[PDB]
Amino acid sequence: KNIANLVFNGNPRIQLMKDNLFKEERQISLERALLYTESYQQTEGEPVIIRRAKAIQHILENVQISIREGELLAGNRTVRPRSGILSPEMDPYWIVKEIDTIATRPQDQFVFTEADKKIYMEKLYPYWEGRSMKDFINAQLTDDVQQAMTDEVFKLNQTDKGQGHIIMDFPAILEHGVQYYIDILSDKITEQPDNHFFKAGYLICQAMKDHFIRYADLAQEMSLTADACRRQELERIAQMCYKLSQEKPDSFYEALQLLWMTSIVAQYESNASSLSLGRTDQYLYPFYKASLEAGESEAFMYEALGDFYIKTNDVVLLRSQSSAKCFAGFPTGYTIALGGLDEYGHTAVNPLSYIMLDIYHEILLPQPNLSVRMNELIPRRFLLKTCETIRLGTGIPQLFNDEVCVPAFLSKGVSLDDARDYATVGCVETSIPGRTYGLHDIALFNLLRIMELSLYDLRYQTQVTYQDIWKDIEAKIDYYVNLVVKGSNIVDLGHRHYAPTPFLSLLIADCLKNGKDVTEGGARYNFSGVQGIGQANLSDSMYVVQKLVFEQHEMTLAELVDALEANYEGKYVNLQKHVIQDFDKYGNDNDDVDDIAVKLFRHYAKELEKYENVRGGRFIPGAYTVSAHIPLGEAVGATPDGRKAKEQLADGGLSPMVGRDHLGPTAVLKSVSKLDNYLTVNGSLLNVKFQPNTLKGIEGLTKFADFLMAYTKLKIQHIQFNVQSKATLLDAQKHPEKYTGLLVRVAGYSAFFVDLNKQIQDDIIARVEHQL
Numbered sequence: 051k052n053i054a055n056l057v058f059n060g061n062p063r064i065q066l067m068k069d070n071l072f073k074e075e076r077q078i079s080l081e082r083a084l085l086y087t088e089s090y091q092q093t094e095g096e097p098v099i100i101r102r103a104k105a106i107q108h109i110l111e112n113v114q115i116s117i118r119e120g121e122l123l124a125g126n127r128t129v130r131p132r133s134g135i136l137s138p139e140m141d142p143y144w145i146v147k148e149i150d151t152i153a154t155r156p157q158d159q160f161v162f163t164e165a166d167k168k169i170y171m172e173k174l175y176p177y178w179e180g181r182s183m184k185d186f187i188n189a190q191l192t193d194d195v196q197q198a199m200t201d202e203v204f205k206l207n208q209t210d211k212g213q214g215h216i217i218m219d220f221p222a223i224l225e226h227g228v229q230y231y232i233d234i235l236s237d238k239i240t241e242q243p244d245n246h247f248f249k250a251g252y253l254i255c256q257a258m259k260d261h262f263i264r265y266a267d268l269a270q271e272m273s274l275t276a277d278a279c280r281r282q283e284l285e286r287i288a289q290m291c292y293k294l295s296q297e298k299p300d301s302f303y304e305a306l307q308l309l310w311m312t313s314i315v316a317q318y319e320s321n322a323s324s325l326s327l328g329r330t331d332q333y334l335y336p337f338y339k340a341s342l343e344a345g346e347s348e349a350f351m352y353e354a355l356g357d358f359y360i361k362t363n364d365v366v367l368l369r370s371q372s373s374a375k376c377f378a379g380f381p382t383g384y385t386i387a388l389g390g391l392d393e394y395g396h397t398a399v400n401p402l403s404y405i406m407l408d409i410y411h412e413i414l415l416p417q418p419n420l421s422v423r424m425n426e427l428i429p430r431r432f433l434l435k436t437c438e439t440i441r442l443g444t445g446i447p448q449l450f451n452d453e454v455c456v457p458a459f460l461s462k463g464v465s466l467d468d469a470r471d472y473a474t475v476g477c478v479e480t481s482i483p484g485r486t487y488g489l490h491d492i493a494l495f496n497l498l499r500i501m502e503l504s505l506y507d508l509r510y511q512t513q514v515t516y517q518d519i520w521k522d523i524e525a526k527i528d529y530y531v532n533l534v535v536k537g538s539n540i541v542d543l544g545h546r547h548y549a550p551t552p553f554l555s556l557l558i559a560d561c562l563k564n565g566k567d568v569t570e571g572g573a574r575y576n577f578s579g580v581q582g583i584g585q586a587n588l589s590d591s592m593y594v595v596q597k598l599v600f601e602q603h604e605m606t607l608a609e610l611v612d613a614l615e616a617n618y619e620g621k622y623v624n625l626q627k628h629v630i631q632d633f634d635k636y637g638n639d640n641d642d643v644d645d646i647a648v649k650l651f652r653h654y655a656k657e658l659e660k661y662e663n664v665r666g667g668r669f670i671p672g673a674y675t676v677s678a679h680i681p682l683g684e685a686v687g688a689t690p691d692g693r694k695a696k697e698q699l700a701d702g703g704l705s706p707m708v709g710r711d712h713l714g715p716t717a718v719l720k721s722v723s724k725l726d727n728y729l730t731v732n733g734s735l736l737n738v739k740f741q742p743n744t745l746k747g748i749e750g751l752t753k754f755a756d757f758l759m760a761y762t763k764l765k766i767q768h769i770q771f772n773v774q775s776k777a778t779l780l781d782a783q784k785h786p787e788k789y790t791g792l793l794v795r796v797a798g799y800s801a802f803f804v805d806l807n808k809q810i811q812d813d814i815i816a817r818v819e820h821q822l
């Protein structure tokens with residue numbers, strides 16, 4: 051039985067709702083697909099965005115709903131907790147290939163019941179075969195794009211699922227309420243009778259009104275047969291849901307209910323990852339304050355917030371076996387940014403900011419993906435509270451640096467007001483809340499694979515120079531950025547032609563004024579975010595090449611490549627130890643290695659910003675991996691940095707390669723700070739791991755806080771921490787049953803260690819355990 055993350059004296063209601071999420075195993079759910087398909091079978095020939103809205107209305111009107119045990123807030127996608135909602139309208143093929151294996155696959159298992167297997171193949175697969183967004187993307191990708199993907203230079207994401215990766219304008223819905231949108235859309239439809247977007251949004255807002263009423267009627271009915279206390283609670287919920295079916299919220303309790311019901315409707319619409327929450331402490335604090343005045347009771351508001359936190363852990367997204375290699379362990383992305391700056395450039399930390407960290411001490415779940423915005427104005431007490439929470443060892447909260455992120459957005463034309471208000475989509479995809487359509491994880495780009503292709507290409511050139519390799523790598527980066535742009539633009543178009551999101555778009559400036567969905571470019575800011583992965587390995591490898599081959603003349607390029615092709619076996623076993631141990635590695639504050647990373651990623655960034663997306667926006671670079679450093683590593687043979695074939699790439703994005711940082715965590719910060727971190731407007735990612743003993747006591751928190759202030763001044767964009775010992779992680783591999791509660795930080799998200807495939811577990815284990 052489990053000894054990880056045991057909670058002492060937790061709130062009983064919070065702990066009961068938490069436990070209920072995990073009582074039964076995860077099942078695939080076809081309920082959304084079935085309803086979606088029913089609607090679509092009646093709307094042939096209508097505008098896609100109307101078909102979408104009517105299908106979403108049909109889902110909202112007919113989905114089975116319940117109010118689960120102890121809940122203070124209504125709203126769940128599904129009655130059975132943590133269901134994998136299938137989207138055959140995006141891709142009906144992959145589930146067929148895995149129909150008998152998804153229950154026992156290596157990552158992200160789900161039960162596909164026998165009844166549902168037959169239902170899917172009889173009622174859903176024949177309709178969606180040849181009719182899905184995936185079919186369009188298969189047909190549209192050109193030949194060189196496809197060849198780059200078979201050469202495993204880059205992956206394209208969301209070809210088989212909703213787009214997501216967007217923060218709605220929650221402050222707008224919180225101040226207006228549902229009926230306000232119904233009425234303005236009425237007037238918009240009148241003033242522009244040919245605009246389908248307005249009609250689509252009208253339908254969904256109406257169905258959201260009705261969906262509130264469904265829950266209200268259910269609460270009331272349930273109250274009749276409920277214990278003396280629960281009856282009053284269910285009556286309170288009914289009255290709340292009747293009110294919020296139309297009216298703007300007045301209390302914190304109501305704001306949380308409107309906030310999560312909006313999230314539920316958004317999930318029915320797009321069924322995607324990273325419909326993140328933005329600056330929740332900023333836009334809920336006025337409601338928390340207003341409730342305090344008026345005598346609402348901090349203990350009740352605490353429980354309602356705890357309900358909300360548990361709600362975010364009922365959502366897990368279903369994906370294919372190959373997709374689960376890149377995005378393993380349910381990175382759901384209900385990401386919250388805390389603190390930061392206000393419109394005046396003053397600290398935005400407020401009393402709710404502290405509460406939202408403290409409640410997490412009871413939750414210890416992967417969601418919400420809490421994040422603290424750092425700057426020089428952070429109150430010390432809040433900084434120490436952040437450190438105390440990270441020390442719990444779940445990986446949450448992560449940090450974002452206002453010092454980098456604000457100017458980075460200013461770089462791309464974001465106004466000062468909007469850039470000061472940034473928050474985070476998903477893992478590390480910094481974004482402008484309620485104003486951005488960023489395609490924040492549209493593609494993964496394997497920089498080490500490109501270097502490998504270049505070394506093999508030049509392997510027989512006896513006259514090759516080191517500068518020749520560099521130019522070749524830069525030329526291949528140019529070539530492949532061009533292709534990943536063309537492929538991302540196809541996926542971009544796929545979502546526009548198959549899956550506009552009219553409801554969500556209502557809450558994205560400036561879709562309502564422009565009359566356009568986000569998929570048509572209605573958002574104020576339009577990006578497409580492509581991730582450069584493997585740069586620690588790239589600079590480590592090219593440093594060896596430069597030194598071993600061209601300055602020391604130990605081998606020739608051809609002889610070295612022979613050793614790589616041989617996977618350092620046989621007569622090369624000692625060469626491997628030599629390239630690893632006898633040459634400076636990235637992450638040790640050695641300018642000579644580090645500058646290779648600086649210059650090559652700068653070339654990647656500056657190439658991406660030459661390209662437009664199909665919405666008139668700009669491509670932007672990120673440097674993050676999720677769990678893709680495993681599959682992207684598997685696609686690369688041995689490299690001059692000492693990787694054996696198929697070995698992982700450096701985790702996270704900006705992290706040193708596992709085990710290569712020998713000079714402590716501050717030398718890591720110094721390496722990372724040499725990168726031009728203003729370029730990764732799409733987000734970058736630094737994983738550090740601390741030995742738990744090194745953070746204990748008041749002394750540990752003080753060292754920890756000082757470290758985060760050094761991180762801040764060094765203008766590193768993001769950092770996050772694992773706090774677990776090697777012994778605990780090895781024990782969790784050997785006796786998973788003792789550690790079913792154990793959370794570990796992968797890359798921009800936390801996941802249950804025992805549910806991570808061994809290759810990810812082994813990455814996390816091999817990361818250096820630092821001391822302060």
Ligand SMILES: O=P(O)(O)OC[C@H]1OC[C@@H](O)[C@@H](O)[C@@H]1O
Binds near residue numbers: 208212215367479
């Ligand atoms: O395949 P998806 O889930 O759409 O994207 C992959 C991942 O991208 C980066 C993050 O936002 C994650 O939360 C998301 O899961």
